[PDB]
Design brief:
The structure is a homooctamer of 150-residue chains. By secondary structure, chain A is an alpha+beta fold. The first copy, chain A, is 35% helix and 31% strand. The longest helix of chain A is centred in the first third of the chain and has 13 residues. Chains A and B meet through strand 1, helix 4, strand 3, strand 4 and strand 5 of A and strand 1, helix 4, strand 3, strand 4 and strand 5 of B. The complex binds glutamine (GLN) (8 copies) and magnesium ion (4 copies). The PDB classes it as transcription. The entry lists the keywords Transcriptional regulator, Lrp/AsnC family Gln binding, ST1022, Structural Genomics, nppsfa, National Project on Protein Structural and Functional Analyses, RIKEN Structural Genomics/Proteomics Initiative, rsgi, transcription.
Chain lengths: 150, 150, 150, 150, 150, 150, 150, 150
């Protein structure tokens, strides 16, 4: 990629439905070239897709959690435990980390009860889990993972 | 919203450039109605936008961190500290949480040095910060915040 | 329930033996209506009972503890462990919680020895327990769980 | 008090509206004597009152928390901080404790937002507070503080 | 015991070889009575013995430790683990405690190597031990366990 | 000192009132020599005194604590803080330690209230104190600091 | 550098006084070329020097510590605090780290007293220090920082 | 050793290739005597070798870690676990320590991936490991283990 590709990506990361004519006018390059560049970025795996940003609040997803997981160590436990956590409905983020915990899990649910049934009751049965500590999110100050270029 | 709106959203959350004809064929409703429903969802704030999912690895964003923040308590410190953390380049997530820490921050950088200059050196000067503990992400097992409907 | 039911409950939560005539005079409604409303609240399960508030100090209950419990995780451990903790004489509160511990237990005893025999020696034998940490209450500043309406 | 007083209290602690005739029949003593004994227990401060046990769930009190507080030490900080915590609407229990924290606070609210406005935003402004850690109650297994005699 | 017994004990707790004539002169009571009182205190188990206070430094006991022990819970583990810890040469204090640890052990050795061989290597083999954390004493500010009356 | 001095000390550390004739018979040395050796040990500071071992339980000292102290760092804080802690009535041991805490304090009181007034309320006013964590002793398995030679 | 430079370095990292003839014979290259390559590595800063590995035990350096430091945050505190720690006699390693602590310090002393005077008493006066936790090394299993190529 | 040996060592610890003539001129002793003294120090094991100080950065060793290890206790676990940790490529320091952890491990790798494959994936399979916490080094302020004489 080059300087122009980054400028294109900087626009698409926050507004993917901005018309080709509008993008071409902003960056200052031929539309045909813009189309070619975007197709290449998709072909090369830089742009992996396009998603609609849906307001979780509109779906009543008010029970937001960040759970730290301590594992029972064993050969390749990170693979086994990581994948089991990733399969839980409501879990959108699973990170293998360095520190006093081994995994950080990001999840969303509508209520305390849903969270207990879909998440807590599933996690407690995973053999690779020693224990977990869930941090309830009182307020989301910022959640814009789509912004990769500042 | 109704059952049909959810099915539309379930598709748009992972593939927003799927054609109207294809979406209409999958859900089984008139294209004109589909267009109307989508426009209403955007007008009502359910769909807040459309973004291109860019592979962070393609931008060499290999230094991924999850930082826990302990604050110096004071009136409305959550607002003041939260906003200062949110303004840091590279920070995409800022959560006010319950537990032994007060904020959880998600950030991405290309290198250790960039992380130190843009993030660590900025955070250490924020008066509302007591201290922080950064968890380095060794491997991202899953990061699909776009999926709001399972 | 309505606004009037709440006012009635606000009185009964701290003084259940206040006469019907006195309550009717305070809220300003017919005694017959007050009686009907109270009976309905009991029938609907809002008022689950009436208790005498006994001063624990009068019973020499001077050894007051708040114990945090870390569990050995397993399928439905919260049910099994929670119920075993709830059965211990002297234990009045058992809460399944989010955080670095899994249960918080509230108990009262007359002495250190009674606490050790009835509580500590029982808890240490429960297989679902990894370990516990007991916080001794030096002084109860406030303990009015009966107040549900502020 | 004597053996008979304890038996009377054991009944009143869970059912204070049980008729005098019924209580007298259960314990086996004259009604006049029972009335005298109860009046004496009230006069002596053993029975401090009578309350209606209201189901918190009926009032939508679904946000239940147990907050640990670390104080900024100073002369008589336990008195000053304890009283400020006790004054917060929704807080029913405040305990000065031994251990890694100095106070344990029990509170109830209807929602996350109410909890943030009435509790979190008030606590963060108290000068005697170093920091706090809130444990969200996922499920109340038992909460019968009225039972003082097992 | 009475006021006079306490005054006698207050003297014997720090100087047991003070002559009977000197003690009688200080407290103001007949020597025969003083002798009788002391014999009674010994007979009743108040005075369990008389020891020479030996300066540990004179024996090169420079490796002073305070070890916290986390146990593997089980029926009567406090008895079993407590006794095994008490049998270790060099260990003079073993306390069953409330908090994040279960036992506190006080020990003294001449060197790091002696401490490792006699204490660490013995403790690591005790099945009731989950783990321990040893706090090395850099300086003893005060160690006068003989003073029971201030 | 020599081998004989150690054997003498091994006896005096647990029974200082054992007669000279009995000690001489046990160790096998002339009484005159034994007396000379003991006087020399006292003169050289090896034997710093003789105390009566008083059973704390006989004095109702049932509230036994081991308190960890975190200090506010500053020049020679260990001297200043250590001495202030050592002056508190009821405190018999004060140790400057390595680890997550800076001092370990051993104290004894008759009741919870005495402990709060004499110890807690005094410690909270010491400026060099950041905070403390008190571990209540449920049972003393062993407390024989007089034994220096095993 | 190339494959040959690495082989040369792999030898020099553990035996720098191995003769040129011996090194040339082992790697299989002309001595003149070996000399040229080594001089270039020194000129380019790859080889920063040559040191004698002295056995710390021979210097009675028996008090080995690894100290974790929590800082008082502020602008560029890592620079200021890091440099002050690095200036302390006996300190050979100072690392700015991610996690619950901010610096890890490696030091060596002959005795507990030397450690207290040269290290502890100096660190406690540094304003940028919140507190520290020192881990005493009981046994060095391995300490070969000179090995950079495995 | 004597005063002169220490002065010789103080020079060799940072510059082992300083010529004999230069060292003799600095310390003020005959070259023949200097040679004899150095040979004796090597023969006596004081000087265990001579190494080239290679700049780790020149080898792209940018992933620097300090890992704390909690062990599963058992007979001689320190020997077994210590040796297994010492065998891992990239690990240069292994210390058996006192405190909340049992071992501190110092290691170096070129990248996050290398660190995960060579270190993390190996450590997680060691049966004697309960868990670990890795502290990533953001900046090395000082790393001069060769300096044994200050
Ligand atoms: N999985 C491992 O090998 C160790 C992970 C652990 N969280 C650490 O930081 O060391
Ligand atoms: N900001 C506050 O009032 C408290 C926040 C803190 N993290 C807690 O869980 O209690
Ligand atoms: N039981 C579970 O699944 C987890 C409970 C744990 N206390 C937490 O907060 O995550
Ligand atoms: N307030 C105090 O003096 C100390 C209280 C502290 N929680 C402790 O356990 O020691
Ligand atoms: N042994 C037990 O039952 C619990 C002991 C633990 N240290 C506590 O404080 O709760
Ligand atoms: N006083 C100091 O300098 C440090 C003491 C601290 N407890 C430690 O272990 O490092
Ligand atoms: N200095 C900083 O900004 C933070 C350092 C802290 N140790 C962390 O891991 O976050
Ligand atoms: N290995 C042991 O016996 C105990 C080691 C532990 N790290 C401690 O400090 O006590
Ligand atoms: Mg998206
Ligand atoms: Mg009640
Ligand atoms: Mg004694
Ligand atoms: Mg070297």
């Amino acid at each position: 990629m080059d300087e122009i590709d980054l400028r294109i990506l900087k626009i698409l990361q926050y507004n993917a439905k901005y018309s080709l004519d509008e993008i071409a006018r902003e960056i200052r390059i031929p539309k045909a070239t813009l189309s070619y560049r975007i197709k290449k970025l998709e072909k090369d795996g830089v742009i992996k897709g396009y998603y609609a940003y849906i307001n979780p609040a509109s779906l009543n997803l008010d029970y937001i959690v960040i759970t730290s997981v301590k594992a029972k160590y064993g050969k390749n436990y990170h693979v086994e435990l990581g994948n089991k956590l990733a399969q839980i409905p409501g879990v959108w983020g699973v990170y293998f980390v360095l520190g006093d915990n081994d995994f950080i899990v990001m999840a969303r649910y509508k209520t305390r009860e849903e969270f207990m049934e879909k998440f807590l009751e599933r996690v407690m049965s995973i053999p690779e889990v020693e224990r977990t500590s869930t941090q309830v999110v009182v307020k989301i100050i910022k959640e814009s993972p789509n912004i990769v270029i500042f």
